[PDB]
Design a protein around this nucleic acid. Sequence first.
DNA 1: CGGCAATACTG
DNA 2: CAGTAT
DNA 3: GCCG
Length: 324
Amino acid sequence: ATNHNLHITEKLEVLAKAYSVQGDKWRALGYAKAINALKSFHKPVTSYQEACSIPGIGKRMAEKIIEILESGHLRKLDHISESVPVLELFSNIWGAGTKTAQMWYQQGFRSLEDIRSQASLTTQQAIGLKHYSDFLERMPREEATEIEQTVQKAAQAFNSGLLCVACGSYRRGKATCGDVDVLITHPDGRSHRGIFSRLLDSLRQEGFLTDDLVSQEENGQQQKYLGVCRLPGPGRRHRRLDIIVVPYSEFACALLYFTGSAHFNRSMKALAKTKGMSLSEHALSTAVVHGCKVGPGRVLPTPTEKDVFRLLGLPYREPAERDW
DNA sequence: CGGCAATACTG
DNA sequence: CAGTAT
DNA sequence: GCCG
Ligand SMILES: Cc1cn([C@H]2CC[C@@H](COP(=O)(O)OP(=O)(O)OP(=O)(O)O)O2)c(=O)[nH]c1=O
Ligand SMILES: [Mg+2]
Ligand code: NA
Ligand code: NA
Ligand code: NA
Ligand code: NA
């Protein structure tokens, strides 16, 4: 798939990112969908009218697209606040979002050294800060493989029947991965229970897990672990690792969800909603139960990812095609 | 105009 | 709840 | 930002 509009999307993304770090999330979501619509266009966009014929692109977006197309630049970029580069730096710290970045900025901080020496940091943020560079670079697929295998071997050592699947960008076939997303379950529908505690303690013992970010181990029904790992050996960097354990009945929906992409997911969930259904990482179900939240819908059994697509009347897409 | 995915921890 | 995260 |  060749993005015939790279010259466009490249500029649009700078703006999209600017709105994002400033907290203007809905406006930023709009650009993202516009940007993906452009990447998927069969040819390079050649006119305002044609740009408008594309869903996700309105008059405002079309103006910018044509300006970039015809001038090779977007003047709006020259007007982005000088605070944006700083807000981006701060929000690049895992555990710190736009609100925290803003707070730090207002306090006068402008560099990571400022944050290290004077900023108030949450436990997660302190970990995000010390591993800033490690976490910012995307690791080579080869390393993600090693990480995934490390987790699989440690788990299967407890039960060879356990299925361990690297999801996220690794599953979508990317060449580099921002982190490693591992999903675990068991066909018998019960042997997944209790694996969390044993897996984490096992990986901690061998020194693989170096820090925890999100992990409620007081909960035996715990399904997610967000932490930090590091392969043994010389020169290995620290990497983000997410581990999810789910009962077999939720395997298809968990696999679908954690494979993503994030945009592919919210788009698919939105489609589900229009068909009177609701899609979570747990299951596809009938429309959730005046005009208010209450009870979950009835679950629609889905043994495989294909089943989810089928019940949604959507053509099936391999993981590599959910790159959105 | 209001909605924009559905959900899971932390403190 | 506010914030951040998947 | 866009859509309905
Ligand atoms: C953050 C986020 C994530 N997801 C899903 C779908 C993706 C997986 C993994 O997320 P990740 O950030 O690793 O992304 P990933 O695709 O693995 O890309 P990286 O290489 O990790 O950045 O979770 C989502 O539905 N909504 C979200 O807001
Ligand atoms: Mg990932
Ligand atoms: Na359109
Ligand atoms: Na962050
Ligand atoms: Na992840
Ligand atoms: Na947080």
